[PDB]
Design a protein around this nucleic acid. Sequence first.
DNA 1: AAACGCGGGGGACAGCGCGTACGTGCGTTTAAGCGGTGCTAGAGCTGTCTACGACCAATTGAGCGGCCTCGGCACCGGGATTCTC
DNA 2: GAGAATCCCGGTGCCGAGGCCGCTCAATTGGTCGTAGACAGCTCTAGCACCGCTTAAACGCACGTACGCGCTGTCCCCCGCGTTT
Lengths: 73, 81, 825
Amino acid sequence: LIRKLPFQRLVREIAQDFKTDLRFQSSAVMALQEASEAYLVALFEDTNLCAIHAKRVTIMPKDIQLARRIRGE
Amino acid sequence: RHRKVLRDNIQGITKPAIRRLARRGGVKRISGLIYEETRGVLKVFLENVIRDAVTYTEHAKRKTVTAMDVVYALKRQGRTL
Amino acid sequence: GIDIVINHRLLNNCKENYEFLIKWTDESHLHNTWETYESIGQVRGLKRLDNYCKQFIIEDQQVRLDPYVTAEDIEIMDMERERRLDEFEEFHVPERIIDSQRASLEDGTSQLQYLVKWRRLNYDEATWENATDIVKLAPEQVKHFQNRENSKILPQYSSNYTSQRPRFEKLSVQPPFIKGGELRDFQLTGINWMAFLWSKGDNGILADEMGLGKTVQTVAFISWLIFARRQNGPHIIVVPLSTMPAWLDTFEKWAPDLNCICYMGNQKSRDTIREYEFYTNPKTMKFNVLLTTYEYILKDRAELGSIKWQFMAVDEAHRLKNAESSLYESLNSFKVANRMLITGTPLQNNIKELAALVNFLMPGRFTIDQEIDFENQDEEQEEYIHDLHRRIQPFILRRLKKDVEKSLPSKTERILRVELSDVQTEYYKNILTKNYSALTAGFSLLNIMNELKKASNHPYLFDNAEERVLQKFGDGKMTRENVLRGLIMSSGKMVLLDQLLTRLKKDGHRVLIFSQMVRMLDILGDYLSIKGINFQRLDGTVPSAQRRISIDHFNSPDSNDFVFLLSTRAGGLGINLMTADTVVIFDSDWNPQADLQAMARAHRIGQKNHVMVYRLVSKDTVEEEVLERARKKMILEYAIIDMDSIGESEVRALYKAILKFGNLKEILDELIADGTLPVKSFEKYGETYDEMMEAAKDCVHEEEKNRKVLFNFKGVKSLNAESLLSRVEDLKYLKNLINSNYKDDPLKFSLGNNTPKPVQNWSSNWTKEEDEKLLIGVFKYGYGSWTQIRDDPFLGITDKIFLKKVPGAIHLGRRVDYLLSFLRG
DNA sequence: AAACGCGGGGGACAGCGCGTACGTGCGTTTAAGCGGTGCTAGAGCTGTCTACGACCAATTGAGCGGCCTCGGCACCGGGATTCTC
DNA sequence: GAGAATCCCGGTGCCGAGGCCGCTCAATTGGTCGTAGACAGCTCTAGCACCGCTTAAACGCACGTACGCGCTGTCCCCCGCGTTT
Ligand SMILES: Nc1ncnc2c1ncn2[C@@H]1O[C@H](COP(=O)(O)OP(=O)(O)O)[C@@H](O)[C@H]1O
Ligand code: BEF
Ligand SMILES: [Mg+2]
């Protein structure tokens, strides 16, 4: 659901700050994709509960902050 | 002209993709503020998992990150999650 | 609906004053009309007009207002206006009638129509149009069209030779099939070699040196096999995109009779081609030839593999380097009787690649059959390479232009070594020293070789280096002068290039630039622009149409643009640049054959002065070792170097034929070849025709005996005397007189002083003119061809005659009987 | 200390109105996806040799357990200060 | 501004902490033996970067409606306080 090349660029850019000039297996990038998608989808399914609890229809960032607090991060 | 080159990486996650994810997450409507907010969260998640993955690969004196190292990072993250 | 608006003629100033030219979304390009805002009112698409209005406003305001805008910018604006107008006019010109249709309307009226493709559009955005208009717009095109479905050159009637190929003997001269010009002697010899090989059934390659005519040779070979052998099955040619226009043009020049299709473009376009062009009334195929590109192979192999192709070829075989190529796999999924590979150079970087190629030609036991690589120098490599040479030499046709064609001027190959600039030197040293700190303000060091390779030619490929020079001129960076100065001095090899280019500008040379890197080519093009030079680019960024017109323009003999600037990958292959005489290779590929191709694009047949090639190399850089890698690859060439029977169905077909055409024995070969008659001895059909003519005369004598109508042939009752005898003599008389005066053109015909009686109260008005046109129709198509007679639009009949409206086939027959009796009286 | 009863105040709940933001559609532009080009580095494998760890025995010192003594913390009471109505 | 609650100060009581002493067990020292790991070399997979070509996704702007937010009014419940269990 997220474009492969942009995500691979981003993950490489982030990795750069721990140590330069890492190479990556493509399967590792796919694993990162699947993990990140799963995490985001879960976080949305969670925060939607907070949104409907506040009797909203929209998601608002207050709700993300709340969710991240309650699950603990 | 050549000057049309530009760079910004984090925007590679963009509103249509975030929309798709939210719709998969059953969301009805979203404020625009969410787009930058979720990007922050996503960076932190990446930040943590990469830190583990690289630390595996450097302990093995590798130059290449493998899917095995990644999945061991996830097996730590999800249980610590 | 509003389609793109074309032009404007005399925001609120625009809306009040101007009228625009509106194309319509559901209508032909010729249906476009001038409209104002108040004329159009409000309708789907109006924002596009507003967007065009904004464009015109920015066009107007920048033209009028700004003293910072030069007269030259106004010239460029006029050049854009004309460049758009040229295409938008030529879109009126038809190029292919696709199909004929009959339409009936709630008016209570019927019309004939053509599906027509415009001269620069795909088959998507083809449209129906009224037949009796397009016939007067493009009578050449409609006649050329209707010849095709009138033709008998078809897979339906291609003669198979599944038992064995027929006899072949070397053809002494250009066969009369071939019309575009004169074959060269060596070209004819190549055709002979291909014919010889095909008569042995073998697949092969043509590898005569680049530009020696391979397109003409191949199309001629097709023409020979299709006409002489009657190998009229579906044939397929796979083509690198940039050359597709010239191929089609070559087809049109050398063998226009062969109907061919450019299966290309958007999905809907291809779908319409599959709908209307491929199949006879869904199957069997209405076309001789496909041209296509590898993209559409990989996409539509699902469809195209369905066809039982007779013959297949590829213009550039080297693209198939290895058996695992998805193209190689998918093409091997095709079913075809023979294959033919064309190349500039078969001997790519590894003998393994040639082994895969010949495996493509032949089953694996034909191949090298031993995968040991070519030794750099040893005994075993010598015996093995000479073994392979002796195996393969029969299957290669190759010739060198130096040997073949001493008329063409030679080439000089020269290399120029240039010292790095300061910025080049420091960047190079910094990447050599892995200096992440230095490159932080310069960075993906994961390919050191690539990074320093692109550094070595030019520093502005690193995104600060421009600012890193301009900021020490932080005001002058606004000036054209200091921008140019900094750019040119950035890179010593550019300083050299500019000096040489200036000398060639003085001396009136015409020059090609090649590079691998699109960013570099962009920088160099911007250099030309700020120097004010006239040039065109070509690479992957330009779709087919704009590149096609750019090549055409630069080939135009007036063309002011003296520089053309190309990628090696897209621009290296098959482009024709014999208006150029000079080449600069700004950098080289790892593969020498790419450089040979790029050179050869200038060194075509028809180039008429000696060409200079300069290769520019950064001295004391890795690329002069890449040159040694190229030489090491180059080394390889120096190593390898019933008929008596008649069936009742045939009796029927003959009887109908002679009822339409009289003494068929003139036409009769065509009547077999078009399948009207099953294949039998021509002599048998002749004698049985004469026999029944005599039997008809006898029947007339029996009528005379009776007074003073069916009769059988070989018991077949499907015959009568009087209709045949009268029809034969009448049609002979008509065709004789029409030839005798008119034959130069029967459209000249008129019945003249013979004044016929009118039609009796038909549902359609009729005159001597309608009679005359009908007679010309019956001459073109014979008696009783009533569908074709009515359909032919040059007769103007197509409205006037019906499929309970009064005149029909019986009335037409009686009218013809009267008209011919009166004229014969 | 918990349970039970009583009154008053505050919060929660609901409805309404208005404005802004979000969604949708259209048109245009750009980048991604797929295939191919080319090369080198790094992984992955194999073999050999050496040093380190494990095992065993003896010896010695420290740590653990018990006991005793003293100090610090908690609790209680009174007076002063702060916060709330 | 007054009343109640909280805080601070001083003394007493005791229990826990801290230290000392003795004995036993664990750690330390030394020697021997085996193998795992380290080091070196070789082979070839696969990753990195870029081009070509196509098509849809993205991106931008405009328009309209729905939802969110704020305000007002009413009713319920819970909190607080006192008494009894
Ligand atoms: N028989 C011929 N007579 C004259 N000119 C020819 C002939 N064959 C080819 N040419 C010239 O060669 C050019 C086409 O090059 P071509 O041989 O098609 O390239 P390639 O075959 O290498 O792809 C044309 O411009 C044409 O002038
Ligand atoms: F090789 Be040819 F000139 F295309
Ligand atoms: Mg070619």
